UniProtKB/Swiss-Prot annotation, chain B:
Active-site residue list: 107, 275
Sorted UniProt keywords: Hydrolase
Gene3D superfamilies registered for this protein in UniProt: alpha/beta hydrolase
Subunit-level organization: Homodimer.
UniProt key word Hydrolase: yes
Family in the record: Belongs to the AB hydrolase superfamily. Epoxide hydrolase family.
Listed EC numbers: 3.8.1.3
InterPro entries according to UniProt: AB_hydrolase_1, AB_hydrolase_fold, Epox_hydrolase-like
Domain annotation AB hydrolase-1: ranges: 29-265
Pfam family for this entry, one: Abhydrolase_1
Function: Catalyzes the hydrolytic defluorination of fluoroacetate to produce glycolate. Has lower activity towards chloroacetate and bromoacetate.
Catalytic activity reported: a haloacetate + H2O = a halide anion + glycolate + H(+); fluoroacetate + H2O = fluoride + glycolate + H(+); chloroacetate + H2O = glycolate + chloride + H(+)
Protein name: Fluoroacetate dehalogenase
């Protein structure tokens, strides 16, 4: 497995729910970066160097992903709810002495991030979400066209062991297909092969795939209910917020949606499929540096 | 594999789209029975003998299923659209000299059957549809709860080879899990094990699994579009119709209110059953069908 973060340390951070793995580089204000599915912290390898020019950058594997430990789940998928993942990452950041930090997330990691901002806004100075809308919004939009396009939100959420059993046949194929299908190119050519190997290696482990399905089960049930309470309450994120999205990505009218969720948000499309930090590393890094800079 | 229709003949019927396998029994007015997914013609084995006391019963494998031939598909999934399957079975029935016949279908077979009534109502004296709503109505009701409750329509319709590769690893597990999941009790106790083996052996062939995925791709795309044209035009089936559904089945998540939108002469009833009415509730299903087709 390649080292894709020149000048970054490797840290195992303890929490009450298990260790969080992170690459840590740079100096200055702290900035936490959170990946999603089906990836690991290494998806930030093209933009983290640029960020570490100006920030102390912490590139964390989500609870249960990558090299982070896997807490035992329960019937309500609790540890892989975004509320719980956010609480676990707040604890990890406390181990480093960071109780007020900047945060950028992509895919599942952006769901942890906006949930963190709703539950504990005092933890965050600024928030960036990459190519997502809130979980509640994607479910409200779940008509035929969306059921077909984001089928995996329902498939991966089927009761165990249905998706686990199917994924075990040829996991390499499924993970590479998801990576390719959500890019603009439709193939794997936007990715560093060394990074694809990190993603394949993780996805090859049945325990890791089981966590992924628990994460989508949470996304269909408790995460949805948590979001629904905030919508019913008219709660809005007060943290200054940036929403970036792919011109051919999944979130796509994104700024109009996030404005119903957040009182201070700017945004922009980037010509890219879903995987902004890998398909469009220079534009994503520039937008993030400019946003997070005081 | 067992013979579950002791006494019935076997026919391999040529059509322009490939052979249709059927078991043939009884005597009297002609009655075509059409299975669905993930089954074959054998799912009628507990009701066909009773029907054969009153009708000439033709128990056919759908195009691409069981022992019927598998036409090569295309970008629009054409041979596995219900419009094409209906045309093919109309050709098959004409090979037997049946140009006007009674029809009962279940699951995909029921979708072939109502599409056949919308496209070619003159071919049918009466029609029964077992535990389905129109494909348009399934998709229209799509929302979070339905997406999570009935996921396979969107999953099996994903572009090839995604579902085919996922189903390849352990096909027995998937087909047995679907058969059990849609019954009242959630297990295989409703099925004759010999019938389950028929289903399992069909599902074990990658070519048969690809046909099934093409059928669901049709169901998400051209079948839905064909339905949408009829409903937006206000077209109703004129053929006298029976909608029979399971109280715990897939369609009920009443069907009769839905079907009255699609058909001008429809009656219907629930049966205490999951989806698989002819195996879960064979005597009630056979009675309901004999009474409807005889009346
Ligand atoms: Cl996501
Ligand atoms: Cl239905």
């Amino acid at each position: 497995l390649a080292d894709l973060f020149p000048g970054f340390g490797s840290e195992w951070i303890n929490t009450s729910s298990g260790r969080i793995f992170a690459r840590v580089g740079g100096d200055g204000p702290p900035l936490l970066l959170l990946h999603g599915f089906p990836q690991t912290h290494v998806m930030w390898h093209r933009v983290a160097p640029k960020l570490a020019e100006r920030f102390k950058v912490i590139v964390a594997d989500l609870p249960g992903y990558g090299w982070s430990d896997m807490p035992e789940s329960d019937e309500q998928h609790t540890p892989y709810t975004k509320r719980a993942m956010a609480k676990q990452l707040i604890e990890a950041m406390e181990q480093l002495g960071h109780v007020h930090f900047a945060l950028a997330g992509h895919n599942r990691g952006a769901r942890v991030s906006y949930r963190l901002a709703l539950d504990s806004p005092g933890r965050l100075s600024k928030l960036a979400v990459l190519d997502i809308l809130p979980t509640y919004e994607y479910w409200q939009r779940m008509n035929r066209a969306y059921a077909l396009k984001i089928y995996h939100w329902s498939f991966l959420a089927q009761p165990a062991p249905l998706p686990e059993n199917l994924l075990g046949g040829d996991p390499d194929f499924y993970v590479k297909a998801k990576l390719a299908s959500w890019t603009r190119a439709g193939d794997l050519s936007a990715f560093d092969p060394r990074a694809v190997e990190h993603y394949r290696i993780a996805f090859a482990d049945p325990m890791r795939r089981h966590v992924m399905c628990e994460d989508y089960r949470a996304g269909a049930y408790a995460d949805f209910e948590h979001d629904k309470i905030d919508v019913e309450a008219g709660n809005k994120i007060p943290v200054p917020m940036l929403a970036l999205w792919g011109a051919s990505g999944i979130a796509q009218t994104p700024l109009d949606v996030w404005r119903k969720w957040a009182s201070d948000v700017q945004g922009a499309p980037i010509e890219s499929g879903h995987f902004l930090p890998e398909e469009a590393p220079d534009q994503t890094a520039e937008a993030l540096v400019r946003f997070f800079s005081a």
